[PDB]
Design a binder for this molecule. Structure first.
Ligand SMILES: Cc1cc2nc3c(=O)[nH]c(=O)nc-3n(C[C@H](O)[C@H](O)[C@H](O)COP(=O)(O)OP(=O)(O)OC[C@H]3O[C@@H](n4cnc5c(N)ncnc54)[C@H](O)[C@@H]3O)c2cc1C
Ligand SMILES: CC(=O)c1ccc[n+]([C@@H]2O[C@H](COP(=O)([O-])OP(=O)([O-])OC[C@H]3O[C@@H](n4cnc5c(N)ncnc54)[C@H](OP(=O)([O-])[O-])[C@@H]3O)[C@@H](O)[C@H]2O)c1
Length: 531
């Protein structure tokens, strides 16, 4: 139940928030968190759908700031399930007594910067008004569920769910005719789970996403114990990579190798599982012909997965470069379509016309359903800020500054909004990275800066408008040497009608981005106006 005056206010208590809280306390600053949720966790509190699971190996997707935590915590599986990750987060929160720094059940609704006093005034739906010198937005990247765009949702007679705001008490689909709309990551995890309770499962595909097998496995406790001996060293290796994990960076071009070496090299990634295929050859993101060679191996893998070819070809991702939507790890998802209580409804060929109260009508036919699950993604990267009335200098709304796309210096800050910091968001590596790496560096960097403002008795930090401008053109130029901008993904805002179609992330790799952030801090925060 919030203070009235705080050195730094933080929004959200997922990985970013909790680290921010801890580190700002270690730095002898007053600090408080405001969080919509009932408890700590962010995505891992929200997304309790059955099947929810990490894409990055447990040993990678975790904090490194605390040596004790590395030592004590025991991961059990190659990819943590959501409850295990939530346990981890609750564990870390207990260990550093973080909850006394967090007001739960409370959404921030506006914030306005008082040029008179170099300070932010932050409002909430409960009615609290807090005044802070610095505002840290740790409100995540995928934290505002997107409904799909059509009519008669309100009308549906059965039960309705978004994966991203799933109920707390487990949901029973036993006996039910169930429909899932969305075959993203969330769709692909949640479906094989639902398929096991329900009498009939209908899967509403628009564009096929690319997925490879996770080959999850138990985590050998010998190996864990071993790794613990050199944990910090291992983490440090992950921090000096483009992607923030131990993925091997293929030195070769997917064009230079023969077909035989191609198939044989990719068959090895396929047996092993996980995302490392993305970096099998250096030019898979940089050259349509390179990418198409990998992409085709994948599609055949998918064809040979499903007994019936008609069904199989509808599962085959067509239209766009492999790796340019999030690459998805599947567990028994394609196998699922062999079960005869599962049906793939292709909405490319037969659009969804409306939801009726009895279910879902396409142009071809209607589908009667007792339950319907939306796995339809999130208003991404900007979604969550946009729900807060954030006003900068001159009373400029950020919602408007950014209306043609996010405009940031390093992603960390935007000009015209002193003392405002975005954690792991547009302008930065963000979700193109093991996010615990992207997130730890940002918190470190932001909180170093705040510590350093206080050390030097300064009170106003602002990004310089031309540097912001130079940063944006830079983010776009590098995006444009890759294949990313070419496709409609949440990365480009394309999953939301009317959202400006810009590739929003920094594609240079984490290591490079940190280097830049470091040279910047080294020079007294070049590109900021400090007063
Ligand atoms: C299902 C799912 C799985 C994921 N898998 C991976 C993965 O495998 N690897 C990876 O690297 N990343 C993945 N991520 C990306 C994910 O964003 C990060 O890994 C990380 O969990 C993000 O944490 P965060 O602190 O940035 O914010 P979030 O965990 O998104 O937390 C933000 C918090 O702020 C709260 N909040 C938002 N607005 C307000 C408001 N106005 N007032 C008060 N509170 C507010 C939200 O409720 C939320 O609690 C996944 C994302 C999803 C959605
Ligand atoms: C770690 C891990 O495995 C994990 C697990 C879960 C999430 N995550 C992370 O969060 C991000 C989101 O993944 P997600 O599943 O929640 O959402 P998505 O990826 O945006 O796909 C939305 C889906 O719904 C379909 N769709 C959208 N609108 C539609 C419409 N109007 N009509 C009909 N269909 C509509 C849309 O169809 P299409 O043709 O591509 O627009 C697509 O099928 C991920 O990338 C990860 O970063 C990670």
């Amino acid at each position: 139940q919030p203070p009235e005056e705080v050195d730094v206010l933080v929004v959200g208590a997922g990985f970013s928030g909790l680290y921010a809280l801890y580190r700002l306390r270690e730095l002898g600053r007053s600090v408080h968190v405001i969080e919509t949720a009932g408890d700590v966790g962010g995505v891992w509190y929200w997304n309790r759908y059955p099947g929810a699971r990490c894409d990055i190996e447990s040993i990678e997707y975790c904090y490194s700031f605390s040596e004790e935590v590395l030592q004590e915590w025991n991961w059990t599986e190659r990819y943590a399930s959501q409850p295990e990750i939530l346990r981890y987060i609750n564990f870390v929160a207990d260990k550093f007594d973080l909850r006394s720094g967090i007001t739960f059940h409370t959404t921030v609704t506006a914030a306005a910067f008082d040029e008179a006093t170099n300070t932010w005034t932050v409002d909430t739906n409960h009615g609290d008004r807090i005044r802070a010198r610095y505002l840290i937005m740790a409100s995540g990247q995928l934290s505002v569920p997107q409904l799909p765009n059509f009519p008669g949702l309100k009308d549906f007679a059965g039960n309705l769910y978004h994966t991203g705001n799933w109920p707390h008490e487990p949901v029973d689909f036993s006996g039910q005719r169930v429909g899932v709309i969305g075959t993203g990551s969330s769709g692909i995890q949640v479906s094989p789970q639902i398929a096991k309770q329900a009498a009939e499962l209908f899967v509403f595909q628009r564009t096929p996403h690319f997925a490879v097998p996770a080959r999850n496995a138990p985590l050998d406790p010998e190996f864990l114990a071993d790794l613990k001996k050199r944990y910090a060293e291992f983490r440090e290796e992950s921090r000096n990579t483009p992607g923030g994990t131990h993925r091997y960076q293929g030195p070769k071009s997917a064009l230079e190798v023969s077909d035989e070496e191609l198939v044989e090299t990719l068959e090895r990634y396929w047996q092993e599982g996980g995302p490392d295929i993305l970096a099998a050859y250096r030019d898979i993101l940089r050259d349509r012909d390179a990418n198409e060679r990998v992409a085709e191996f994948i599609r055949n893998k998918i064809r040979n997965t499903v007994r019936d070819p008609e069904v199989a070809e509808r599962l085959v991702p067509k239209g766009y470069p492999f790796g340019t939507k999030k690459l998805i790890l599947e567990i028994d998802y394609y196998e699922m379509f062999n079960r005869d209580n599962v049906h793939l409804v292709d909405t490319l060929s037969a659009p969804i016309e409306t939801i009726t109260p009895r279910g879902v009508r396409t142009s071809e036919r209607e589908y009667e359903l007792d339950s319907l699950v939306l796995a339809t993604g999130f208003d991404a990267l900007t979604g969550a800020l946009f729900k807060i009335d954030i006003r900068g200098v001159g009373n400029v709304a950020l919602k408007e500054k950014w209306a043609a796309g996010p405009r940031t210096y390093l992603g960390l800050s935007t000009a015209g909004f002193p003392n405002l910091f975005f954690i792991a968001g547009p302008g930065s590596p963000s979700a193109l990275s093991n996010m615990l790496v992207s997130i730890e560096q940002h918190v470190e960097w932001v909180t170093d800066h705040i510590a350093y403002m206080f050390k030097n008795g300064l009170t106003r930090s602002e990004a310089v408008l031309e540097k912001e401008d130079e940063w944006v053109e830079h983010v776009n130029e590098i995006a444009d040497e890759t294949l990313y901008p070419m496709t409609a993904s949440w990365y480009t805002g394309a999953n939301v009608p009317g959202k400006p179609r810009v590739f929003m992330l920094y594609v240079g790799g984490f290591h490079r981005y940190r280097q830049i952030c470091d040279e910047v801090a080294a020079k007294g925060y070049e590109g900021f106006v400090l007063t």
